[PDB]
Every structure is written in structure tokens, then in C-alpha cells.
């Protein structure tokens, strides 16, 4: 899906497999968090389906023993002074010492501020003991979390469930066309992109000699030259787009390990999965009821949330007993209006726009008793469209490696751009998730005093009861980062800013800051930064000391009666789009043993009417709806055509018959050596073996199994 999903697919520990466990008969004591997982396996990230607790992720600092046991690094402390020597220990040994906590008050000289410290004892219990017998310490916080869980700011303010959901949903974002980087994030993004492997990094120092959109030529310092090629508009395993772009000039000097080109979801070397949007938190006219989202129309005009998706089609020209199939232009009788895009020898032209039902490659197959031929060309499935990017043709004449009995193989690539629309799914890093319920014009959204409309509206009834208030903290800090600040320290420094590092007392508009996972900004520092923020181009301050603004009403013009919480938030677009989920059917292919419709979208398939829906129908008392559902719409082979004819001609719907499934059941029971019979009111078992009945085919058109030819 993106670099993070690939980087996390590896670094995955699985309990299932040959010689392991079972997905159903697993239990409840093996799917739990053990006190020995601290530092070795992340307790937060895991699936929430039937695999919960049976799949996990390695922690950031862990490694693997030669025997196969996981180890973690500890810093050794002797006689009350914390040294700088690191030793890797495994759980067997870690149960023999006393290990302190990562965030303890070191006195800048190797001694703890307060003797009483929380330590982990032998059996995994945590106890408060004087700082006198400790002999090891954690190397740093965030040592117990994985790589995907270390990219969530303000993680210690969220509950475990929503944090797990956010960690899982960060791996589903689709690459966008711009990919800007977060305003407020953690420090883990730069390393998680270089080590994923979706960027180009210089191998040796040199002076860049030439740069284009195709390659980068670097002239090393010892007279050698090296050229890097780039992959443009390359399809991914999941249908997305993989692109790389140079970010160097024509005279710059580079160094070993420096980043040279970008990737799918990368911005200047940092991982970037979403966009920064202006958020107001309030209920609005009921269009954001029950986790729905309201969006602006500037995100469609300016292509803020847009992505490219690619698709691939295949066809083969194989041999057969009656002859050989060949792709050509001389198709049987079909209008010459549809043979226009096809080039001189079959396959379509590059750059041609195609729609559902168009021909891609024209193949003709010998029909059979010459001139006996049939049309089996490659069409475009239902509901698909887009340009044609490339065509790949293999042949047996030029000695190409192909399976036996195939002379030619053709693949066609089709790409399309995709804008945001109602039904698409959005999410945040803190477990937020919803679908777009409405898209509003720009001129009827709440706007600030200077006239800037908001971009997205999030309801206020879902925050308090889910226990994820890291999002409002992120909103406040994002507003402060966007606008900039300056702490006034002319006469001393404020009491709340004593611990703030210098160079963090002043910021310029559109700054980028970092908040590590378990030690970042406190609420005192945030409350202090909210009170010293720079004004806009006019001497105006839009947001007060509480992080709330006064908005206007876009449809009536009257200001709202109370101030509202406004800020900036990082939103990502998930790969659950409503274009891959809409489906409808009236008549199509059927099965073979039982004559019921096929299932799925790939083939025109019907929806299963299960057992519990039958219970509901029987409880309602609807005796004709159920009978019609189970006989003429599913299984009655003779009632389907009569129903179609009656509907087309406007007469009354006839009565059902006997479905095929009952007949198949009777045949199987007889095949088990059982004498099943259907009796009449006076004996004389019914024949129930068809007969010489009307065999007429009216209505001409095929009921729907296949399409209709001109």
C-alpha cells in the first residue's frame, strides 16, 4: 500500500504456521500480554479480527540471539552512578536483576534525584523501592513500542484500543499526488523512510553533474561517474502508483547517505502519509451525525486529496484442436465504428480513452464446422475507465519464453485519477475514522474573522466517551506551529518555560516541531504557547488563550453564539473507496450443479439471502415475499424466463414451481441407497421427472448470462 506497510510486513512475528497454533482452537491465555514482552514485542499493535494476539511486531531496539531468543539493551549502573555501558539481556537473565525506569530523574552527574523509584522485580511485578540496589536501567523510553506505534504524537493520552486502531490504520493510507509532511510529528519519520527503501540515497560523495526527471548523474571525487535511473508511474502490488522525483539541483554537492530522490509517500526524506487541514469541532445541521464528516469544496478544486490508480489486463492466443487462434482486425460482422481505436494489427493505441464495454485487443477463434470464426476479444469490465498507458506484447516468433501452446501474450495498462467524493473513508493518527457525508461549497462554511473558511468539521460527541484526547492537543499544537510564536523574555524567563530548550522560545510561521512518544510537550507548555502567538497580516489574534475562535455562519451570516475550538490536524486518505464497493444485478451467470446465481463482484453475482433473514421474514408474516425470493428469483429454472417475459410485456407475474435444489437433494439421497418418494393424496408417488412441455424461446434477447451484440 505504501512504504510503511511494506516495512512492517517484515518485522512481523507469527504464532500460526506448520508446527504452531490454530486460529480457532487457540484460547485466551496465549493471546495475552505477558510481563516478559517488555522491550521485545509491542503490546499495542495487533490485528483486531480472529488473529488478535497471534501476530505481533518487533520492538525498535530488539535483536535476535543465535539460539533464537530476543534481546534488549540495558545501561549498566554501579554503586548508584549510571554508566554508559550497554549490555544485551534476554528474559531469562532479566529475571535475575532489578531494572529501573527509563524516565528517572538523573542529576546530570549519574545519580538519581529521588531514592524511591519504580522498578521491575523478578516476577514482572512493579514496586517502589529506594534507589540503592538497582543494577540496570532502560536505554530510553519508546523502547517498548514498535515502529508504527512510535509515529503517533501524544500517545500516552490515548486509550489502548484507539491507539491500536490508529497504528493499524496508518498502514492503509493511499499515496497522494503531492505528499506534504506533518506540521507536528515525532522524530521517527526520517529513519522509517530511509530504511524502508523507497527513496534513492547517494552511495558516495560527489558533485551532481546532471539532473532530469528520468535520471541523476553524479560525478564522484576520484574521476568516476554514476547514473541513477528512476521508476516512473509503476504499478504496485495493490494497484497504487509508485513514483520517484529528484530533489537536487545541477551544481549541488552531495554526501554519502544523503537523500537524492523522493518516493510514493515521502516529502524531502520524511514519511508523509496525509495533509494538514483546518478543523473546527462542533455539531453542524446533522450532516456529521454518527461519525460522518463534512468536507469543503476547495479540496476538490485544488486536488488536495487525489490519487492515481492503475489496472492491468491480460489475454493469450493459445492453440486448439480445430486450429490456432490469432489476434487480428478482421472481426466478424461488427460495426466499423467500434474498430476505430484499434491499431493496424490488433491491440489498442496508446493514449486512447476507454470506457466499459470497449475492445482492447481483437482476437478471433475458429468456431468449428473454412471461415468458421467467433469473436472472443478482450473487453473492459463493468464500471472501469481511464487512459491507456502502456502495452506489452510477447511473441513466439522472436524466441520468447512462453508456456506450451501459447503463441502471443498481451498486457494492457489503464490508469485514472481519483478525486474525493461522498463515501470515501478518512482517518487520523489517534483512532479517528469516518466517511464523507457531505461536500459543501466554500461560501457556506463557517469562516474566521479575516474570512478564511474551515476545511473539515468534526463532531464533538465522539471525543469524550472514546478516551482519545490526543487529537485536541494535536489541534492546539498544530495551530501554534502554523501561526508561530515568540516568548517574551526581556525581563527574565517565565516560570513555565524553565525546562523549554532554547531555540524553542521563538518560531516562524509554518514551523515543524517534534513530540517524542513518551516525553514531549506538557500541558503547561502548551497552555503557555497558546498565549504568545503572532498576529496575522493585520494586528489581529484569531484564537484566544483557550484555543477557541469566534466563527460566522455561512448561510445566514449571523455569528455563532459561543466560541469554537479551531486548529490544524493531519488527515490521511484510506484505501476504502466507494468506487470499489457499489454493485447491482438483475440477471446474469448461474451455477452448474445448483442453478443459483454466482457470488461476488468479479462475476455478476447476487446477494446471499441467509437463514436469519428467512427468520425475520417468517416473523413479519410475509408469506409471498419469501416464496418469491426462494423460487423464481433463485432456483426455479422455468419461472425465471416466464417472469422476465411477463415483466417486459406488462402482464401478471405467474406462479412458481419446484426448485432444482430439492431435486439434487433427492438424487443424492437415492445415491446413498435410500428409497425416497413423494406421494399423492391417494398414494401413487409423483413422477417428478419433467415432461413434454412448452419449449419456446420468446423475448429473443438472452436473459442476461452474457451481453447483447449489435
Amino acid at each position: 500500500n505504501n512504504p510503511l506497510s511494506g516495512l512492517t510486513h517484515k518485522r512481523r512475528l507469527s504464532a500460526l504456521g506448520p508446527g504452531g497454533l490454530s486460529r480457532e482452537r487457540a484460547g485466551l491465555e496465549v493471546r495475552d500480554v505477558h510481563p516478559s514482552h517488555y522491550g521485545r514485542m509491542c503490546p499495542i499493535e495487533t490485528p483486531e479480527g480472529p488473529n488478535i494476539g497471534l501476530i505481533g511486531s518487533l520492538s525498535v531496539y530488539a535483536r535476535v540471539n543465535p539460539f533464537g531468543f530476543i534481546e534488549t539493551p540495558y545501561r549498566k549502573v554501579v554503586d548508584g552512578v549510571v554508566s554508559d555501558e550497554i549490555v544485551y539481556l534476554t528474559a531469562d537473565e532479566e529475571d535475575r536483576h532489578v531494572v529501573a525506569q527509563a524516565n528517572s530523574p538523573i542529576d546530570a552527574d549519574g545519580r538519581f534525584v529521588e531514592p524511591r523509584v519504580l522498578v521491575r522485580r523478578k516476577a514482572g511485578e512493579v514496586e517502589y523501592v529506594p534507589s540503592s540496589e538497582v543494577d540496570y536501567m532502560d536505554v530510553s523510553p519508546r523502547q517498548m513500542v514498535s515502529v508504527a506505534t512510535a509515529m503517533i504524537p501524544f500517545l500516552e493520552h490515548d486509550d489502548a484500543n484507539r491507539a491500536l486502531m490508529g497504528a493499524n490504520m496508518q498502514r492503509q493510507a493511499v499515496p497522494l499526488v503531492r505528499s506534504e509532511a506533518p506540521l507536528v510529528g515525532t522524530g521517527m519519520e526520517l529513519r522509517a523512510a530511509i530504511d524502508a527503501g523507497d527513496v534513492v540515497v547517494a552511495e558516495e560523495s560527489g558533485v551532481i553533474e546532471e539532473v532530469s526527471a528520468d535520471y541523476i548523474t553524479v560525478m564522484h571525487d576520484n574521476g568516476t561517474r554514476r547514473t541513477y535511473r528512476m521508476r516512473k508511474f509503476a504499478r504496485s502490488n495493490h494497484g497504487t502508483c509508485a513514483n520517484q522525483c529528484p530533489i537536487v539541483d545541477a551544481g549541488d554537492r552531495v554526501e554519502a547517505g544523503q537523500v537524492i530522490a523522493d518516493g510514493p509517500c515521502t516529502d524531502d526524506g520524511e514519511m508523509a502519509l496525509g495533509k494538514n487541514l483546518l478543523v473546527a469541532i462542533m455539531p453542524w445541521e446533522g450532516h456529521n451525525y454518527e461519525d460522518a464528516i463534512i468536507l469543503s469544496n476547495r479540496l476538490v478544486e485544488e486536488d488536495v486529496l487525489t490519487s492515481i490508480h492503475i489496472e492491468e489486463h491480460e489475454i493469450d492466443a493459445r492453440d486448439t484442436k480445430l486450429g490456432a487462434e490469432e489476434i487480428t482486425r478482421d472481426i466478424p460482422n461488427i460495426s466499423d465504428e467500434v474498430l476505430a481505436d484499434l491499431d493496424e494489427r490488433g491491440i489498442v493505441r496508446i493514449g486512447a480513452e476507454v470506457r466499459d464495454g470497449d475492445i482492447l485487443v481483437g482476437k478471433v477463434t475458429p468456431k468449428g464446422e473454412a471461415r468458421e470464426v467467433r469473436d472472443t476479444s478482450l473487453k473492459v469490465p463493468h464500471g472501469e475507465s481511464g487512459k491507456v498507458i502502456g502495452i506489452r506484447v510477447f511473441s513466439r516468433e522472436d524466441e520468447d519464453e512462453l508456456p506450451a501452446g501459447v503463441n502471443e501474450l498481451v498486457r494492457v495498462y489503464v490508469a485514472q485519477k481519483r478525486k474525493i467524493s461522498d463515501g470515501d473513508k478518512l482517518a487520523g493518527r489517534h483512532g479517528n475514522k469516518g466517511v464523507i457525508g457531505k461536500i459543501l461549497p466554500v461560501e457556506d462554511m463557517p469562516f474566521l474573522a479575516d474570512g478564511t473558511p474551515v476545511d473539515i468539521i468534526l463532531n464533538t460527541h465522539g471525543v469524550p466517551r472514546r478516551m482519545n484526547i490526543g487529537q485536541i492537543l494535536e489541534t492546539h499544537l498544530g495551530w501554534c506551529a502554523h501561526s508561530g510564536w515568540k516568548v517574551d523574555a526581556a525581563k527574565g524567563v517565565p516560570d513555565w518555560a524553565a525546562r523549554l530548550p532554547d531555540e524553542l522560545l521563538e518560531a516562524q510561521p509554518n514551523a515543524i516541531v517534534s513530540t517524542p512518544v513518551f516525553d514531549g510537550a506538557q500541558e503547561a507548555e502548551l497552555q503557555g504557547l497558546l498565549s504568545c502567538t503572532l498576529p496575522n497580516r493585520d494586528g489581529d489574534v484569531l484564537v484566544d488563550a483557550d484555543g477557541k475562535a469566534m466563527l460566522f455562519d455561512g448561510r445566514s451570516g449571523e455569528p455563532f453564539p459561543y466560541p469554537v475550538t479551531v486548529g490544524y490536524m493531519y488527515i490521511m486518505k484510506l484505501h476504502h473507496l466507494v468506487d470499489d464497493k457499489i454493485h447491482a444485478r438483475s440477471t446474469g451467470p448461474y451455477s452448474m450443479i445448483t442453478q443459483q446465481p454466482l457470488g461476488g463482484k468479479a462475476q455478476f453475482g447476487g446477494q446471499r439471502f441467509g437463514e436469519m433473514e428467512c427468520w425475520a421474514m417468517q416473523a413479519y408474516g410475509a408469506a409471498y415475499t419469501l416464496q418469491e425470493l426462494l423460487t423464481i428469483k433463485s432456483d426455479d429454472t422455468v419461472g425465471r424466463v416466464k417472469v422476465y417475459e411477463a415483466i417486459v410485456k406488462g402482464e401478471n407475474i405467474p406462479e412458481p414451481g419446484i426448485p432444482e435444489s430439492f431435486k439434487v437433494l433427492l438424487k443424492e439421497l437415492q445415491s446413498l441407497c435410500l428409497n425416497v418418494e413423494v406421494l399423492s393424496s391417494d398414494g401413487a408417488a409423483i413422477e417428478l421427472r419433467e415432461g413434454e412441455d412448452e419449449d419456446l424461446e420468446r423475448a429473443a434477447a438472452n436473459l442476461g448470462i452474457n451481453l447483447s451484440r449489435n
Binding site: 525498535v60 531496539y61 539493551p73 545501561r75 554508559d84 550497554i86 524516565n103 536505554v139 530510553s140 523510553p141 510529528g185 522524530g187 526520517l190 529513519r191 530511509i194 552531495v254 554526501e255 554519502a256 547517505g257 544523503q258 537523500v259 524531502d268 526524506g269 520524511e270 525546562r499 530548550p501 531555540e503 524553542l504 514551523a511 515543524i512 516541531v513 517534534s514 513530540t515 517524542p516 516525553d519 514531549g520 510537550a521 507548555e525
Partner: peptide
């Protein structure tokens, strides 16, 4: 830090890391 051309992203962290990832 430690990467030749990384962008500047100031941090709120108070502690020091003896070991790199």
C-alpha cells in the same frame, strides 16, 4: 541529526539518548 541533509525539526524532548536505533 546524524543524517547529512535532514531538515531541521526542533524537539520538545528533555532526555538524552545513549544509543541510536
Amino acid at each position: 541529526n546524524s543524517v547529512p541533509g535532514a531538515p531541521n525539526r526542533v524537539s520538545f524532548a528533555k532526555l538524552r539518548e545513549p544509543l541510536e536505533v
